[PDB]
């Protein structure tokens, strides 16, 4: 048998998020209810945060897992309160993330990274944090990157 892979964006913890996968389910003869249930069961860790979900199909089964992403990892490590779209809109991600958490995200992202150094991966993750608009070490992420490039900040693993 052959293995089929799908990739989608879904809000974690929410059932009925597989409505966009109905064109995918159509030719595949799958069950939309069970596909959505598996997506929710996989994304129980991420509450109210958009995440990249991988669906694996072999023979007649359905496996769901969560692919790590830089922005999703930054938003999760931000430890923001859960939000319901009927209650919170136009939310800003402007919390504080410590450098140890940034390095941990870089570790979770090093396996599929083209950076030759954990410092390079850390600078990429810091750029993503700058994009999401949060603060790192109570400082601007680009300023943290500038300090790293000057060498006042040292990445432990070499």
């Amino acid at each position: 048998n052959e293995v089929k892979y799908l990739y989608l964006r879904a809000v974690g913890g929410e059932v009925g998020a597989s409505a966009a996968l109905a064109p995918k389910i159509g030719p595949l003869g799958l069950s939309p209810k069970k596909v959505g249930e598996d997506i929710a069961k996989a994304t129980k860790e991420f509450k109210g945060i958009k995440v990249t979900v991988q669906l694996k199909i072999q023979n007649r089964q359905a496996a769901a897992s969560v692919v790590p992403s830089a922005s999703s990892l930054v938003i999760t490590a931000l430890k923001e309160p859960p939000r319901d779209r009927k209650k919170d809109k136009n939310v800003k991600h402007s919390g504080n993330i410590q450098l140890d958490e940034i390095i941990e995200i870089a570790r979770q992202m090093r396996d599929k990274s083209f950076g030759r150094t954990l410092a390079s991966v850390t600078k990429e993750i810091l750029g993503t944090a700058q994009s999401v608009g949060c603060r790192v070490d109570f400082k601007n992420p680009h300023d943290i990157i500038e300090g790293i490039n000057a060498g006042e900040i040292e990445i432990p693993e070499n």
């Binding site: 030719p27 595949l28 083209f114 030759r116």
Partner: protein, 234 residues
């Protein structure tokens, strides 16, 4: 008056000047002293993810690209202008899209890696056909019969003028779907491919050809000799 008026674009990137050529020149002449083996690699029609995977797999070494004349001038074009003794042979051995691999590993290890590295690729023009492909009769789908049409999604209508004019494929739009009256054979296996057929295969997403780096030769720093490698030069 009466001259062609150049198009003006408002983009965010400017062109590179002579300073970038000088910078790559300096980097080559420094790496010549830093590393011990200098390998000449032919990398025509290589994709950037493949090149970046190669750079990653050779971490700790240097892979330098750039203009061939710039690389040859940095290595020294002639005997009286070469950076190191008997480097002009390696310099003149460069051709085409040339990369230089500055490394410190064993000759056997570099040879083994470049002999064992292969990836699937799009078929280029003026290459042998890796298969015989035909668009099936009826509605044209995105893969064109490689995967079953039930899984496959029909070709978007916006590609019909491209298929009709650029690829010269007889197509008609029926109910927003691209249809052909008869099956259309694109290429027969073992046949030299032109730009049109290569474009059709690339459009349908067929990647049956193989990619492999060519290795011309290498130069040893202390031995000051060049040895022809002749890797994947068939």
């Amino acid at each position: 008056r009466s001259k062609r008026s150049k198009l003006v674009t408002l983009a965010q990137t400017d062109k590179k000047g002579r300073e970038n050529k000088e910078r790559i020149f300096d980097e080559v002449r420094e790496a010549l002293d830093t590393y011990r083996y200098v390998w000449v690699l032919h990398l025509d029609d290589v994709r950037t993810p493949v090149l970046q995977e190669i750079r990653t797999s050779w971490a700790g070494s240097k892979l330098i690209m750039g203009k061939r004349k710039v690389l040859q001038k940095a290595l020294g074009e002639k005997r009286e202008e070469e950076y190191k003794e008997n480097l002009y042979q390696l310099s003149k051995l460069c051709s085409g899209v040339t990369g230089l691999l500055f490394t410190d590993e064993d000759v056997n290890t570099v040879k083994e890696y470049f002999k064992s590295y292969v990836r699937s690729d799009y078929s280029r023009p003026n290459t042998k056909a890796p298969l015989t492909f035909t668009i099936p009769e009826g509605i044209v789908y995105s893969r064109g019969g490689q995967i079953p049409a039930e899984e496959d999604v029909p070709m978007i209508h916006s590609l019909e003028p491209t298929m009709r004019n650029k690829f010269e494929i007889p197509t008609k739009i029926k109910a927003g779907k691209i249809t052909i009256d008869s099956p259309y054979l694109v290429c027969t296996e073992g046949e030299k491919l032109d730009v049109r057929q290569a474009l059709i295969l690339k459009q349908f997403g067929i990647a049956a050809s193989e990619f492999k780096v060519k290795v011309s030769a290498y130069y040893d720093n202390d031995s000051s000799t060049v040895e022809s490698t002749n890797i994947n030069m068939e």
